Design a protein around this nucleic acid. Structure first.
Lengths: 108, 543, 125, 51, 113, 359, 99, 125
RNA sequence: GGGGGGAUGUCCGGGUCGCCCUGGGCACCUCUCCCGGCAGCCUUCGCGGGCAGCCGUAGUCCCGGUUCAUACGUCGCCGC
């Protein structure tokens, strides 16, 4: 009878909120979410939800791919790395593990 | 102890790097040239340039663009800019919360700040106004990365904890908005040993953005956040906040007592510092008129709402769903009904400058409550769904009792005893039955004088026992409690129970990976809205 | 002073009221006062006691003898209990602060006792 | 959003149960007093002014 | 005059550009005079102020070695006593102050001190 | 699980129509968890359930409907009744839940039941040990307590079991709020029964020793004031009130004297404790400022030992260096002191002896 | 002074004074304990002044009057506070008899 | 009276201390008292005050004047400090009902003055 | 702070009278484990756990006996 909606909102993680190329979008990575806002009107253009599930695994880092823009690299505390692309959502359901003990940081 | 660092490259080759290490003691050490110092066994003497302005740990340090300026930000809510060509320093001093993260744009123009109260502002340089503002839910979070100034053993070490549930009402006349109590930042809220949440924000539920914010208790964003000794100041917490039937009034209670370290000279005999801080309490009861643009205005403030030889704690307030009336239960025993009258001293009314008369709230009724002392009492109250009867649980340990009071007359319609095992946590009134929780959880019908469902909840710690709470729906007759699964810490799980009014089987049993801090009922439709620790909001609906 | 007090409380004077309040006499005055002006006297005494804290002894004496003399005279009124309510409010504010003020009185009594002891030594020396 | 520097707000202290009202200050604001005596101390019969 | 001593080294890269490496309050009053010396394996800078204490800072190892506060009292003791008469005695600008002590120490083992 | 209790209640109805009280009493013993031996604690009773409590009161007590009823003992000789008394289930909410049928038209129901019930317990037992146990066991309103004080003054005003409950009901009726005490006392008392009670409270005041001097409270003042306001002028309107206010003024002067002596003696005791600590440490040789003579100093200030920790910027805590501890001790010396070094110090064992000038 | 109680700094505000300004703050405390609208803040300031500066009371005679003159007005403000709770009983007696 | 108080306390006498207790000379008496002997005087005054509640118009001047002139000798005796810190604990317990007992004094000052009022009115009518 | 011991100094019955002891009063050094805090190093995502721990007091070669504070945008006069 009762149903539960998928979680929205989120707490902004301490990973740096990255600017897009040509400074028009801002990519803010929450816990369990990464969403792109526009700089001009301050309305969000996409919300890429991220399944986190193992009690405390957190999004460890996130950065634009320096080879090609409009990609990301999002990495958890356990071994998991996503290569999603903002303005779309291709890459959420296909992560790649890394065989860590616990992933403390990553930089691209 | 390194809190952060930013490296800038001195250049299509890589000639050198310049490292700015922001340490946990407050300083920013700039190591000017590194590859030409460690390129060359033997090295020459390297010596960083020290830039010390922040008292607490510096949260973020970044070089700015061309490399002239070193922008930085710490707990002191001030974006600082080291000029670095002269010796000077210029700063954007009074933000809302701690500057938890900064970035610089690809061009030199924009900065983007992640402020500690769940916010991001893209500022433009030397206009210095936020050209882009994004706000979140700002509630209390059990943080993953713990803190940046919990590294060096301060006077009060900042602990990731939730001591009390979040104070929040979904507002009727606009059920997409949610009024909820927040502090200046999350770290500035939990710092000081007590929740210091002297602000509310209105938060849109249908499109999850923080719409607006306002102060309720006294706050000083433009003063220094930290005392001269090093303890962060605490601000008056808005404990009880509940909203009127019409959509046009709001009544809050905010408490503040001085810290325990501060007294030290009021002790005379058997008085300990906790007793002196409890004696010097300040419990204001403020009535707010909510405008159309979600702007709150004071109409009255009552300095001592329940008074005897000293001031008394106020345990709960409730709004009558049929009139504009607020009932407040205190520690003196009495339940007071406050109602709005017009300001009129001797027939000459006092009006606002546009012409409308000035309303003012005052105590319409006083009801002394009966006590039954078998050989620290807490209270709970709720109206009916109809009005005309107010149920008031009065709460000494194990022997406690509910009194059903008429509203039109001050007489007691009923008294019911022997229904509480421990100390009363809360009590709500669905259509005919009182749903109340102490150490037990009891649905107790008063039209039949018969308890339908009774549960003995599992024994847990005192923090979890404080963080259990419920909420009724009043449209589809269903109630919902919330309890973390058994001192509190980061990795805890919580499970909420959806019950109907009539049966004993729980109609939805769902556990959550993080502890939920608040449950609320949407007033227009059925269902509930729940707010988690790792602060995400999600709605539950039947159908 | 009964007729003078009657005049002052009946026409809302200040000069006559203050010149009869600044001054046996008080008992005869409240006993010869009219019954209907007793609540007016209570309100006009609560006002002066709030506005000025240094006049509490004489004003509490006046309120005390008024409540002695015209007790049931205020009960036969009874829709005007709000004057007694404002009076209760003013006296509650006057009796605010008593435990901390007693603690501070003891903290000062120790200093006064030591100063008087050293004066008693210095006179004999 | 640099918050603007606000000074310390003065305390709205509560007032007793006979405050000086707006109309009492309005009729106290008839301030400047000139007392012109009549000739030979004659009692004043009538003052008037046109509409 | 803010009893502050600041140390500057040139910024790496551009020439003729100095910047403050670090500052510290070594004295208790203003720093009115200082002079440096660098030779025979000794690079010091001696700063005298208004608190009469010459403070010696290491120059080439600054931030690497502790400073040293030389005594403000003169090297000669300037305190002389006649022990058979128990007179202690000290002199400055043009006066000689002589104290007599009138008693032993074994007698006192506080109102009489 | 309602149907199981319904079948058990129908079986007890069959036992009632059989009029066999013994197996019914054993079934109530099994439910509450004949011989009927007791545990010796009013608190240590096992938890029972509300429907069996309601059935117990419904079978024991009775009601008369003639537009106003009367509770009566259908079972005046019952271990079930003394268990209800000792376990405190005889509350007005409990008996109203037991009698929802017959009382739903009746008004003033709390006043009627609170007037009737302690009278019923007192007529059950003339020794009223069951009434004193009810006073000590049940949640009691002000009507029940003023009727119980009426009963104990009927009994008095082997020989201590009544005065114990007389002490209990004063504490309970002092805990109750002023309004219900005044209205129930004005209802159920006569203005000479109140004079009897005010002589009992004078016996509790003067014999306790307040008017008595030394060389030769809050729970009784509430009762005296509530009785005086409950009678008022309609009861009295002699020298009894003048001697009454004389002894109350005497007790007030005693309490104010106790306030002054409380403040002075507490401050002198706290100074003596901290000065004992500081003199013990100065005898060890940590060389603090202590007062020598036997009068109290002007500022009641003792020098504490220097803490091992220091508060650095911005708020952090570091260890005190012994260098800085020595600096603060050099501040803590005076302008003249005799500091005897012993041969045991020069050997390296003991500590010095310091006698400093009294500042 | 309420802002200096809320920001934890009233001890810091009072601890650096000299003799004449201690006499000035004592004179304000004595003059303004009488109003019960700030009796709490005024008594707290007097607590901190007693804890800080009760050691020089034999050193300076004029401060020894100002500690005795503040007990002299504190002694008259229990009598005002006891007479207002005496009289508050009589008002409480009359509102009971109206019922 | 300086030498009668010395002998009465060393033998722990019960009668001879009371002979000096009822009779400025009292202040000049205890300024010359021996201080270890002075603590013996405080031990019995705290013994009678702790066992029963009461009053003493003369002992308020007595106890305070000894705690100033001979309170600094309290460091030498560890027994008396614990007896005084349980004494000031129970003297708080009398102090809790000072507010409720002052309201009782108000009603008796009300009713006795009203009973005298009707009795004067019978001779006035 | 307690539980306890080895040792310092002491009076009252004292003892063949000496080493001191038992009975009473005791203040200190040292040892011992529990009390409150602080750090390291392994384990686990965390929660917690494990290992060998230091501090709860006193004076230093010199010496941290330091480092640390919250902007601009505009001033003046009078009125309600």
């Amino acid at each position: 009878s009762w149903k539960v909606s998928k979680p929205m909102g989120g707490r902004m993680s301490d990973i740096d909120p990255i600017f897009s190329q040509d400074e028009r979008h801002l990519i803010i990575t929450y816990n369990t979410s990464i969403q792109v806002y526009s700089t001009e009107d301050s309305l969000l253009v996409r919300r890429i939800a991220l399944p986190l599930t193992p009690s405390a695994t957190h999004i460890v880092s996130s950065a634009l791919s320096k080879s090609n823009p409009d990609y990301l690299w999002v990495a958890c505390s356990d071994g998991r790395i996503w290569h999603i692309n903002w303005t779309s959502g291709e890459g959420v359901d296909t992560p790649s593990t890394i065989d860590t003990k616990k992933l403390l940081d990553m930089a691209v | 102890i390194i809190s952060t660092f930013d490296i800038r490259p001195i250049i299509a080759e890589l000639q050198d790097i310049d490292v700015a290490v922001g340490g946990a003691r407050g300083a920013i050490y700039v190591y000017s040239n590194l590859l030409a110092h460690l390129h060359t066994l033997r090295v020459g003497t390297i010596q960083p340039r020290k830039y010390h302005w922040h008292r607490r740990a510096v949260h973020s340090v970044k070089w700015s663009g061309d490399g002239n300026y070193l922008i930085s930000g710490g707990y002191e809510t001030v974006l600082v800019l080291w000029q670095l060509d002269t010796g000077r320093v210029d700063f954007l001093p009074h933000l809302s919360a701690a500057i938890e993260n900064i970035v610089v744009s690809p061009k030199g123009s924009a900065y983007a700040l992640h402020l500690d109260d769940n916010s991001a502002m893209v500022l433009s340089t030397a206009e210095m106004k936020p050209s882009m503002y994004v706000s979140g839910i700002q509630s209390l979070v059990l943080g993953d990365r713990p803190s940046k100034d919990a590294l060096v053993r301060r006077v009060w070490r900042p602990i990731d904890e939730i001591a009390s549930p979040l104070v929040a009402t979904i507002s009727p006349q606009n059920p997409s908005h949610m009024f909820l109590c927040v502090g200046n930042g999350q770290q500035a809220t939990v710092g000081g040993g007590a929740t210091s949440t002297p602000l509310v924000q209105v938060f849109d539920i249908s499109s999850f953005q923080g719409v607006a914010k306002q102060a309720i208790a006294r706050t000083n964003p433009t003063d220094v956040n930290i005392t001269s000794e090093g303890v962060p100041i605490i601000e008056p917490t808005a404990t009880k906040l509940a909203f009127s039937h019409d959509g046009k009034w709001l009544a809050s209670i905010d408490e503040w007592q001085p810290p325990e370290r501060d007294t030290e000279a009021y002790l005379t005999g058997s008085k300990t510092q906790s007793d002196a801080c409890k004696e010097r309490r300040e419990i204001y009861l403020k009535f707010w008129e909510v405008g159309a643009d979600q702007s709150l205005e004071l109409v009255t403030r009552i300095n001592d709402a329940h008074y005897t030889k000293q001031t008394e704690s106020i345990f709960d307030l409730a709004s009558d769903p049929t009139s504009a009336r607020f009932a407040t239960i205190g520690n003196d025993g009495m339940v007071r009904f406050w109602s709005p009258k017009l300001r009129k001293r001797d027939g000459l009314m006092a009006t606002r400058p546009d012409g409308q008369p000035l309303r003012s709230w005052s105590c319409s009724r006083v009801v002394p409550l009966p006590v039954h002392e078998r050989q620290p009492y807490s209270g709970a109250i709720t109206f009916s769904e109809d009005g005309s009867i107010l149920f008031a649980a009065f709460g000494p340990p194990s022997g406690a009792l509910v009194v059903a009071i008429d509203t039109q007359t001050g007489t007691v319609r009923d008294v019911v005893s022997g229904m509480f095992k421990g100390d009363i946590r809360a009590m709500k009134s669905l259509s005919s039955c009182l749903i109340m929780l102490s150490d037990d959880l009891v649905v107790y019908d008063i039209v039949s004088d018969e308890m339908l469902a009774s549960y003995t909840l599992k024994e847990t710690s005192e923090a979890a026992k404080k963080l259990t709470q419920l909420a009724v729906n009043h449209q589809s007759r269903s109630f919902a409690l919330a309890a973390p699964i058994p001192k509190l810490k980061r990795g805890t799980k919580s499970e909420l129970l959806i019950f109907n009014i009539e049966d004993e089987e729980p109609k939805l049993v769902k556990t959550f990976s993080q502890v939920i801090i608040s449950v609320c009922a949407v007033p227009s439709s059925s269902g509930f809205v729940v707010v988690d620790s790792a602060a995400q909001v999600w709605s539950i609906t039947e159908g | 002073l009964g007729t003078v007090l009657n005049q002052a409380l009946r026409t809302d004077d200040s000069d006559l009221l203050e010149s009869c309040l600044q001054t046996l006499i008080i008992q005869n005055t409240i006993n010869r006062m009219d019954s209907s002006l007793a609540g007016t006297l209570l309100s006009k005494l609560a006002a002066r006691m709030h506005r000025r804290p240094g006049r509490a002894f004489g004003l509490m004496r006046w309120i005390q003898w008024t409540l002695v003399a015209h007790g049931g005279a205020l009960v036969t009124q009874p829709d005007l209990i709000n004057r007694l309510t404002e009076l209760s409010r003013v006296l509650e504010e006057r009796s605010r602060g008593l435990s901390s003020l007693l603690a501070l009185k003891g903290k000062l009594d120790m200093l006064d006792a030591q100063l008087k002891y050293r004066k008693a030594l210095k006179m004999a020396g | 959003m640099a918050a603007e520097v606000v000074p310390l707000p003065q305390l709205k202290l509560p007032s007793g149960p006979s405050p000086i009202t707006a109309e009492q200050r309005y009729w106290r604001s008839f301030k400047k007093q000139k007392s012109h005596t009549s000739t030979a101390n004659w009692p004043i019969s009538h003052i008037s002014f046109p509409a | 005059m803010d009893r502050r001593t600041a140390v500057y080294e040139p910024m790496a890269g551009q020439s003729g550009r100095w910047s403050k490496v670090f500052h510290r309050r070594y004295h208790q009053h203003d720093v009115k005079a200082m002079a440096s010396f660098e030779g025979k394996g000794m690079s010091v800078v001696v700063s005298g102020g208004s608190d009469a204490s010459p403070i010696v800072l290491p120059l080439r190892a600054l931030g690497k070695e502790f400073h040293r506060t030389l005594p403000h009292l003169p090297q000669h003791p300037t305190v002389l006593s006649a022990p058979k008469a128990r007179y202690i005695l000290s002199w400055w600008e043009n006066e000689i102050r002589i104290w007599h002590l009138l008693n032993s120490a074994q007698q006192f083992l506080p109102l009489n001190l | 699980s309602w149907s199981e209790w319904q079948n058990k209640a129908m079986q007890a109805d069959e036992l009632l129509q059989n009029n066999d009280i013994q197996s019914w009493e054993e079934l109530m013993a099994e439910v509450f968890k004949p011989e009927w031996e007791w545990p010796s604690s009013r608190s240590d009773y096992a938890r029972v359930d509300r429907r069996w409590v309601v059935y117990a009161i419904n079978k024991v007590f009775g009601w008369e409907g003639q537009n106003t009823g009367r509770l009566t003992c259908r079972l005046p000789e019952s271990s079930v009744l003394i268990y209800l008394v000792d376990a405190g289930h005889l509350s007005t909410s409990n008996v109203k839940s037991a009698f929802k049928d017959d009382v739903r038209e009746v008004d003033k129901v709390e006043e009627l039941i609170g007037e009737q019930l302690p009278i019923i317990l007192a007529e059950v037992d003339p020794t009223m040990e069951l009434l004193v146990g009810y006073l000590s066991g049940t949640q009691l309103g002000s009507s029940e307590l003023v009727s119980s004080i009426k009963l104990l003054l009927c009994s008095l005003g082997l020989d201590e079991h009544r005065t114990r409950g007389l002490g209990i009901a004063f504490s309970k009726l002092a805990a109750c709020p002023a309004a219900e005490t005044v209205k129930s006392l004005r209802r159920l008392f006569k203005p000479d029964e109140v004079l009897v009670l005010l002589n009992v409270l004078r016996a509790e005041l003067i014999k306790d020793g307040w008017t008595t001097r030394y060389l030769d409270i809050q729970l009784i003042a509430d009762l005296m004031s509530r009785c005086i306001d409950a009678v008022g002028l309609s009861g009295w309107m002699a020298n009894f009130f003048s001697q009454f206010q004389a002894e109350i003024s005497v007790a007030l002067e005693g309490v104010m004297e106790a306030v002054r002596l409380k403040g002075v003696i507490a401050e002198a005791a706290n100074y003596a404790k901290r000065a004992r600590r500081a003199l013990a440490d100065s005898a060890k040789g940590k060389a603090m400022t202590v007062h020598m003579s036997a009068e109290l100093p002007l500022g009641l200030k003792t020098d504490n030992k220097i803490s091992t920790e220091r508060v650095r910027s911005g708020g952090e805590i570091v260890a005190r260096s012994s260098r800085q501890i020595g600096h603060f001790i050099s501040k803590r010396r005076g302008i003249y002191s005799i500091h005897r070094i012993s041969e045991e110090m020069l050997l390296g064992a003991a500590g010095p002896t310091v006698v400093q000038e009294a500042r | 002074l309420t802002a200096l109680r809320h920001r934890s700094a009233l001890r810091e505000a009072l601890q650096g004074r000299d003799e004449l300004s201690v006499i000035n703050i004592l004179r304000w405390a004595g003059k303004y304990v009488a109003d019960p609208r700030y009796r709490s803040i005024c008594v707290d300031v007097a607590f901190h002044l007693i804890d800080l500066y009760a050691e020089h009371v034999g050193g300076s005679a004029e401060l020894a009057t100002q500690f005795q003159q503040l007990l002299a007005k504190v002694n008259r403000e229990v009598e005002k506070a006891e007479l207002a709770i005496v009289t508050g009983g009589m008002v409480e007696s009359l509102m009971m008899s109206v019922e």
